[PDB]
Write a protein that binds this ligand. Structure first.
Ligand code: ASP
Ligand code: ASP
Ligand code: NA
Ligand code: NA
Lengths: 298, 295
C-alpha cells in the first residue's frame, strides 16, 4: 500500500513582500499538516484535500472563503471544485456567497445530489437545504481586500490541494474568490473539471492556479495529465502544459501534481507560488524558485 | 483554402416519436442550411456555428432557447458556450433566464468582456447592459415540456470549418428535466460540451451532462485525433471510455482541420446534419443516412 502524499498551493501570483511571506508560510504549513494528519490516520484522499482547502479557506491570508478578493461591486463570490480519482466523482460550485467554506459545499454537491455543478442562487438554496450556515458577507470581507479593489479601480492567493492516499486513491480540491474587480457572476477555472483540477486513479491528480481564463482555454489540469499518460515525468508534464499555456494564450499560472505512483511536483511560470508538500514524515515548502526547505513533521 | 463544412446536432436521445421525427428533420435542415449559408458568404466558423445554434434555440422542438426543458420549479434555466479555434477565445453562460438566445450572449461574453464564463445573476446583468431583451419566462415554456415535468414529478450544437481553415463550436441547452435549481451541465464548460483548436479540430457534445464533464469528452476526443486516430476512431474511443468508465451515454459531432467529419453516438438516437460540397447529410438513427442536394 502506497505512502500517502499531499501537496497544497496558494496562489500563482507576482512578487510577495517579506511580511506576507511568513504569514503565507504558517497557513500553508497548517494546511499541509491538516491534510497529512488526515492521510496518516488512514483517511481518504478526498477527505485530505477537503481538509487542506478548508484550512486555507478559513485563513484570511488566502484568496478563498474569508479573505476572498472582491468583485466589481465590493462583494465576495467564490468558486470551488473537488474530484475523487476512483470513480471520477466530482462536485463544484460557482458564484457562491455568504458561506464560510465553498469547498465543503462542492463536496455536498458530489455526494448529496445527482449533479456535479451548482451555481449562484441554486448553490445558495442547496446549501440552505443541507444546513450550511448563511453568514453576513462582511465576515468574508477583509480590509486588505477593500484596499486592493478600491485601487484596482483607479492573480494571487488562490488555493488547492492534491493527495494520494494509502489505498491508492487520488483527489484534488480547488477554491477561490476569483480575480479582484471581476464582473458580477464571473466564473473562473476553479470549479471547472479539467481546468481547475482533475483527478484520476489511473493517472494522477492536478490542481491549478493563475489566470483562470487561460487555464480554461487550454484545460490546463487535464492537459498536464495527458502528458503523464504519454509517459512524461510529472515535472516534464507540468513544464510542457504550463509551457503551452504561455505560448498559445499568453497566460501564466502554476500547478501541483501527484502521480498514481506517488511522484509529485509544484511548477509555475508566474513569479511566485506558495506551496507545501508532505510525504515520508517530511514537510517540503517554497514560494520562489528553489527557495525550497525540507523540515521534519513531528 | 479549405472546403467549408458545418455539422449540427439536435441532442442525444432515447427513442424518438414518429411524428416528432419529421419536425426534428426539418429543424436540422434549417440550422445546417443557415450555418452553411454563412460559410458560403465566406463567413467565419464562429458566425456559422452561432447562426446554426440560434436557429435551434428559436425552434421550440429543440431543448435550447425556446423549448428548453424545465427545472424542478417549472422554469427555464439555460447554458451555452462557443469557442474560436484560432486563439482559443471563448464565451460561456450558465443558468441564464428569460432571454431568447443564450448562444448570442455567450458570444457577447467572448467578444465584449475580459472573461470567458458568466453565470445566473451576473449574466442577466450583462445581458441587460448589452441591451438583450428580457422575454417572459412563460414564452420559453412549451406545453409538452410542462407535461414532461409532470411525468417526472409524479440539447443542440454545431461545429464548423471555414474558408480560411478556422474551426469553431457552439452548444446550447436547457439541461435535464426536473434538474435542481442552478444545476450546470457540460454544455457551457470548455472541454466538456465542446472544444475548438485550429491545430486539431472542433467537437460539440451531447448526452449525460455529468458524465460528459467527468470525462471531459470534447477534449478527450481531440486528444485521440492528435494521436493519429481518424475522427471516427477518436469518437468511438472517447464515447467508449465514457460508457466503460462512468456509465454515461451520449453523442458528438467533430470536424478536423483537414475537413473530415463525423456524427457518432452511444445514446439510441441523435439528430444530426452536415453540409459540405453543396450537399446535405442527415440522420437520427445509426446506419440510416439521407443525402440531398443543397442549392
Ligand atoms: N484561477 C483563479 C485565479 C488564480 O488562481 O489566481 C481564477 O481565475 O478564478
Ligand atoms: N448535455 C445536456 C443534456 C443533453 O445533451 O440533452 C446537459 O446535461 O446539460
Ligand atoms: Na481564506
Ligand atoms: Na429551441
Amino acid at each position: 500500500h502506497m505512502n500517502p502524499i499531499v501537496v497544497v498551493h496558494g496562489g500563482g501570483a507576482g512578487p510577495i513582500s517579506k511580511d506576507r511571506k511568513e504569514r503565507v508560510h504558517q497557513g500553508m504549513v497548517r494546511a499541509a499538516t491538516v491534510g497529512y494528519g488526515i492521510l496518516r490516520e488512514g483517511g481518504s484522499a478526498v477527505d485530505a484535500v477537503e481538509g487542506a482547502v478548508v484550512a486555507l479557506e478559513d485563513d484570511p491570508e488566502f484568496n478563498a472563503g474569508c479573505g476572498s478578493v472582491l468583485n466589481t461591486n465590493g462583494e465576495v463570490e467564490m468558486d470551488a471544485s473537488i474530484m475523487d480519482g476512483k470513480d471520477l466523482s466530482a462536485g463544484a460550485v460557482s458564484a457562491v456567497q455568504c458561506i464560510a467554506n465553498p469547498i465543503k459545499l462542492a463536496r455536498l454537491v458530489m455526494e448529496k445530489t445527482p449533479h456535479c455543478f451548482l451555481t449562484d442562487q441554486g448553490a445558495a438554496q442547496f446549501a440552505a437545504a443541507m444546513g450550511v450556515p448563511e453568514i453576513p458577507g462582511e465576515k468574508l470581507v477583509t480590509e486588505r481586500n477593500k484596499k486592493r479593489l478600491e485601487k484596482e479601480k483607479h492573480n494571487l492567493g488562490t488555493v488547492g490541494a492534491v493527495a494520494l492516499d494509502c489505498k491508492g486513491n487520488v483527489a484534488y480540491a480547488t477554491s477561490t474568490g476569483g480575480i479582484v474587480n471581476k464582473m458580477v457572476g464571473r466564473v473562473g477555472d476553479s470549479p471547472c473539471l479539467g481546468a481547475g483540477g482533475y483527478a484520476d486513479n489511473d493517472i494522477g491528480a492536478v490542481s491549478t492556479t493563475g489566470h483562470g481564463e487561460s487555464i480554461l482555454k487550454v484545460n490546463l489540469a487535464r492537459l498536464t495529465l495527458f502528458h503523464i499518460e504519454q509517459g512524461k515525468t510529472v515535472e516534464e508534464a507540468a513544464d510542457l502544459s504550463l509551457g503551452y499555456m504561455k505560448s498559445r494564450v499568453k497566460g501564466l499560472g502554476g500547478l501541483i501534481v501527484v502521480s498514481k505512483t506517488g511522484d509529485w511536483v509544484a511548477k509555475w511560470t508566474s513569479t511566485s507560488m506558495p506551496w507545501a508538500a508532505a510525504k515520508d514524515g517530511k514537510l517540503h515548502f517554497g514560494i520562489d524558485p528553489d527557495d525550497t526547505t525540507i523540515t521534519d513533521l513531528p
